[PDB]
Structures are given as structure tokens and as C-alpha cells.
Design a protein around this nucleic acid. Structure first.
Length: 594
RNA sequence: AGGA
């Protein structure tokens, strides 16, 4: 469609790659939007600027390997850390396939609404989610919040870690003269740097001023001098200043430095362009640009964020650059990624990583020893017909399980401008392997959703108003983070999933399961258009028919199991193709009714 | 139409 073009002939003409993309809304061909194995994010979210920032922290080896590395152990208390881990892990699994951050965003909204770090952190993030139109100096405001929320939660995981402080930690001592000849210092470990209205090129002078500056402003005119004597592994900058000075950045050739050298000699910090021109003491490190997030002012005068990314190749010692839109993913050259001459380009969040540490490969969770203990026990929140797991039933790379989920609606379409909200409510998984414990369920759990729902859909989902955890119908009610882990482990071990319309369930549980692990009875029993109903298909291929009233997931998952078993029968003997049309004639002439 |  001539959209992956990321360049043009005029500086004012924005390439089609940086344009607004249409909503996903339903099968959507994504093959003309990304030809690489690096996935994109579904833009059908409430707060849209967060998608660009998650992609930035994806391609840091230290940032990625830790958040994914926290998935071996069960940490449900830390919501934003594990939901980002699920998101980071699933995006690497997709290998180009579409991904959604809806589960990560539902955890960020619930954590923010719990305000009943300063409160100004959470209060600002709440207003932007409910109303995308990029505001002034808002994306970096979320950057400081995200890292600070990760640092706080990182110290609360099991076998508590400080790995994120050993990578983002900026030991900044803030000295202030309270009176004549009386110094007062504060030692605060900040996760990211901020750019102010610096006075009088290149980017290095702006970084040096942010690490050693002298200001005069207080509640009298008390001068304050804050400096940092630490060089962390990844250096996250929150660049924000005036437009009149932003226009001067456009004219400065090669303003964004790709690689640079710098260390501390005196109480200040100095950064040099080449390894020869630097001076001072013995040791000095090298920093390379790992990526940055820039805003695009459209020609229709609208705004959105993109993410530039550099990733190392261990085979060939070179750097492959990438530009990440919502789902528009392109491989670009380094000359085009560092170009700031375009007036619509405005860099907002720039990060630098250690040169020797950027070359570190990305390690998945598969390399660690994962703990699958949640599958064998219960984790009911409130104290108040199935059989749970035994250690003999060890799920293998080919274990059959029948899955069916049901969920309620939260919001409406809200057109004008896309349908937005539908959160998981109930999910039940069945044993698929033949034997004594065959066709019986092992996990039948509810979510703990407390948000104001709009419609329960009692006729289709078949749940009662009992999702308020302690109030109504405490029947194996459990959280949403815990049950996801149960589903995530089965996909991790390689269990094959059977059911009806399984692609739709995974879209709202927000987990991507590969093709060779899904056995969808809807696709197996598909003949062109007019997908068949599960209750109608059971009443014409088998004998069970409970009038299809107030659907239950334990039933829909059990009939979908034997419907699969009936498929292998009609497939072992050369029957299925003949019966595949036999049901059609009985359906076309009966209007698909019981 | 399935899918809730």
C-alpha cells in the first residue's frame, strides 16, 4: 500500500510510516505493515502514548532480561512488574505477530485509581488515560513514573533484587544553602534524568548541565546545586524544553550523538565525542544510543509517538535500526534514525546504554528454571465441582487441555473512536488426556474485577453479579494476575489448547498462543462463511442439548473437547469431508435452528 | 453469522 516508506523528498512532508494508522476493530492482515520478526502493539488502548515507551524498554538487554527473568517466580503482589514481564515475554514469542498491552494497561489504571512517589505522579497519569492527543511534556512524565514504579516493585519481589537500580540508578546529591555558610545535602537515587531550560551544537552539553547545575529558586532565593557522581548502565533522559529552543535543535547538524565517551574527573561530569579528546583519570566508559521516543506533529496538526530502536547482531558486527509505530514496523538505516532536520520530529525520551553491555544477548524465560507450583495449589482470595492437579499429571509439550473463557463488558463503542473495553471474567480449563481423569476440569476460576461494569451478558457469558470479591458469590473467586499465570505456563510448557473460538478468547485474555497449539473446533468445522454455533453444532453432531440457556464455561469447554474427539473420528475414517456438507444441507434448509 |  506504499506505507512502509519512511522517507520523502521534502522536510515538511511526513512519510507514510509516521502517519495515523486505522484502528484494528476481526481479522486484520498485518503483513503489509511489518516484514520483520519484531512485533507491534495494538493501538486500541485508552492511553496511547504508553505503547511507544514499552517498545523502548523492550530493546535494552538489562531491562528486558530482568523483567522477563522475574517470571520464573510467582510475584502477584507486584502488578506492573509481572504484567510488563508477560507483555515483554509474549512480544518476543510472537516473532512479528500482533500484540496488545490491554492487560498491562488494566493494571496501570487499577494501580492509579488506588490513590484513595508523590500523588502528583498518579494524578497526572489518570487524567491522560481517560482522554491519542499527545500533551506537552506528558510522555517523559510517564517515563519517570514507570521506572519509579518498577524500582519500588522490584524491591518487593521474592529474593528481592536491586538490578534496576544498578542499571538506572543516578546517585544525585542535592545540596542547598539554607543560610550563610551552612550546607544541606540530600542523597536521592533517581531513575532518569530531566532536561531544563538550559542557557547558552550537540546533545552532550545538555547532558552535562543536567548532571551538574546551579539554580537559584526556592519557597527566599536560596541557591541550590545538585550533582550526580554515578554513571549507570542505561542512561534514560527525559528531554523537555521550549519550542523556541527546539527549533534551534533542528538546525544543529548531528545534534543527536550516536556514541560518545564520558566519566567523572572533578565533582562534575564531562562527556567527550572521541576516545582521544577526553581527559582526566584512568577509567572512562563508552555509551551508545540504545533508542529514543520522538513525537510527530502531523500535517493535519495531530500528534502521536514513535520509537526508534537499535539492536545488535552477534553474527555480523553491525547495528540494525528500527522504527516502531503502533503496528507499522520498519527497518531503517542509522542515517535516517539520527536525522533531526524534520520540523515535525521532536525527540522526547532518549536513552543511552553501555557499549559493552548493549552487545549482551536477550535471554528469554525459557533459559531459567520456572516454578509451575501455581497449577498444583489454590490461591483463593476469599475463604468461601472440580479436582485440582496432582504431581503425577505433569504437563508435557503435547498435553491436551480444553479451554473456554467468558467475560463481561465494561464500556461501550464510544464512536464519533473505536470500541474499547471488555475485561476477562471467568475461565475454565479441562483435562484433555484420556484416562480416569479425562474430560474433568482442574481449574475453574473467576477474576477479581472491581471496575464498574456496564453489561454482564448473562445470556452469553452466563455469570451472575458476583464479581465483587467479598460481597456476592465467593465461588473460587481469585485475581486476574494469578489465573493468567496458569494459562501462561501451559503455553510455556507447550500444551495444546482445544475449544471453540479460541482466537477470540486469547485476544481478551491478552496472550498469544502459536498456531500448532490451538485446536479450534470452529475452524475445523468451518465451511466458507456462516460459522456454526457451539450449541447448534452439538445438537446436530451429538445428542446433548440443554436448550442453550444461561451458558456456562464448564459446559462449553467440555462439549468443545468431545467435538474435537468427534473430529478425529470423522478424520481417521474418510468421513469428515462428506459430513462437512451433510450438516450444511441440514442447516441451510432449517435456518440453523433447533 | 459464529465468538461473549
Amino acid at each position: 500500500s506504499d506505507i512502509q516508506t519512511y522517507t520523502s523528498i521534502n522536510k515538511y512532508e511526513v512519510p507514510p510510516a509516521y502517519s495515523r494508522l486505522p484502528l484494528t476493530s476481526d481479522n486484520f492482515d498485518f503483513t503489509p505493515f511489518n516484514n520483520t520478526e519484531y512485533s507491534g502493539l495494538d493501538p486500541d488502548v485508552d492511553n496511547h502514548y504508553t505503547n511507544a515507551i514499552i517498545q523502548l524498554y523492550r530493546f535494552i538487554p538489562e531491562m528486558f532480561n530482568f523483567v522477563v527473568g522475574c517470571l520464573k517466580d510467582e510475584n502477584f503482589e507486584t502488578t506492573l512488574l509481572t504484567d510488563l514481564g508477560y507483555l515483554f515475554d509474549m512480544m518476543e514469542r510472537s516473532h512479528g505477530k500482533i500484540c496488545s498491552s490491554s492487560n498491562f494497561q488494566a493494571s496501570l489504571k487499577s494501580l492509579t485509581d488506588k490513590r484513595q512517589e508523590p500523588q502528583e505522579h498518579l494524578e497526572e497519569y489518570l487524567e491522560s488515560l481517560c482522554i491519542e492527543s499527545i500533551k506537552r511534556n506528558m510522555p517523559q512524565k510517564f517515563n519517570r513514573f514507570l521506572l519509579s514504579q518498577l524500582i519500588k516493585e522490584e524491591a518487593q519481589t521474592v529474593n528481592h533484587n536491586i538490578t534496576l537500580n544498578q542499571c538506572f540508578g543516578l546517585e544525585t546529591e542535592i545540596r542547598t544553602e539554607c543560610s550563610c555558610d551552612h550546607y544541606d545535602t540530600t542523597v536521592k537515587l533517581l531513575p532518569s534524568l530531566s532536561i531544563s531550560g538550559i542557557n547558552k551544537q550537540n546533545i552532550l552539553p545538555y547532558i552535562e548541565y543536567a548532571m551538574k547545575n546551579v539554580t537559584q529558586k526556592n519557597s527566599e532565593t536560596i541557591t541550590q546545586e545538585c550533582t550526580v557522581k554515578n554513571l549507570p548502565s542505561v542512561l534514560s533522559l527525559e528531554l523537555s524544553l521550549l519550542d523556541t529552543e527546539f527549533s534551534n535543535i533542528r538546525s544543529s547538524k548531528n545534534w543527536l550523538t550516536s556514541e560518545f565517551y564520558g566519566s567523572i574527573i572533578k565533582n562534575k561530569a564531562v562527556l567527550r565525542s572521541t576516545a582521544s579528546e577526553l581527559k582526566g583519570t584512568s577509567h572512562i566508559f563508552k555509551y551508545e544510543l540504545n533508542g529514543y521516543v520522538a513525537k510527530i506533529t502531523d500535517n493535519n496538526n495531530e500528534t502521536r509517538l514513535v520509537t526508534y530502536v537499535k539492536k545488535y547482531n552477534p553474527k555480523e558486527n553491525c547495528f540494525k535500526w528500527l522504527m516502531f509505530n503502533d503496528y507499522l514496523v520498519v527497518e531503517i538505516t542509522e542515517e535516517e534514525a539520527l536525522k533531526m532536520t524534520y520540523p515535525w520530529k521532536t525527540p522526547e525520551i532518549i536513552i543511552y546504554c553501555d557499549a559493552e553491555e548493549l552487545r549482551k544477548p536477550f535471554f528469554s524465560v525459557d533459559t531459567y528454571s520456572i516454578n509451575y507450583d501455581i497449577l498444583f495449589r489454590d490461591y483463593f482470595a476469599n475463604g468461601i465441582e472440580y479436582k485440582l492437579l496432582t504431581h503425577d499429571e505433569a504437563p508435557k509439550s503435547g498435553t491436551l487441555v480444553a479451554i473456554d473463557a467468558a467475560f463481561v463488558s465494561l464500556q461501550s463503542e464510544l464512536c464519533e473512536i473505536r470500541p474499547k473495553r471488555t475485561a476477562l471474567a471467568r475461565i475454565s480449563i479441562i483435562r484433555g488426556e484420556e484416562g480416569e481423569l479425562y474430560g474433568v476440569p482442574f481449574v475453574d476460576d473467576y477474576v477479581v474485577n472491581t471496575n464498574h461494569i456496564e453489561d454482564y451478558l448473562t445470556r452469553y457469558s452466563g455469570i451472575l453479579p458476583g464479581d465483587l470479591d467479598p460481597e456476592k458469590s465467593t465461588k473460587r473467586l481469585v485475581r486476574r494476575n494469578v489465573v493468567y499465570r496458569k494459562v501462561w505456563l501451559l503455553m510455556q510448557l507447550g500444551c495444546v489448547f482445544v475449544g471453540h473460538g479460541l482466537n477470540n478468547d486469547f485476544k481478551h485474555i491478552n496472550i498469544n498462543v502459536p498456531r500448532n497449539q490451538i485446536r479450534d473446533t470452529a475452524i475445523y468445522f468451518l465451511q466458507g462463511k456462516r460459522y456454526l454455533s457451539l450449541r447448534y453444532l452439538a445438537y446436530v453432531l451429538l445428542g446433548m442439548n440443554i436448550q442453550e440457556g444461561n451458558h456456562d464455561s464448564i459446559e462449553d469447554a467440555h462439549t468443545a473437547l468431545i467435538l474435537y474427539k468427534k473430529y478425529l473420528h470423522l478424520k481417521e475414517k474418510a468421513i469428515f469431508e462428506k459430513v462437512l456438507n451433510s450438516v450444511y444441507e441440514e442447516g441451510r434448509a432449517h435456518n440453523f435452528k433447533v
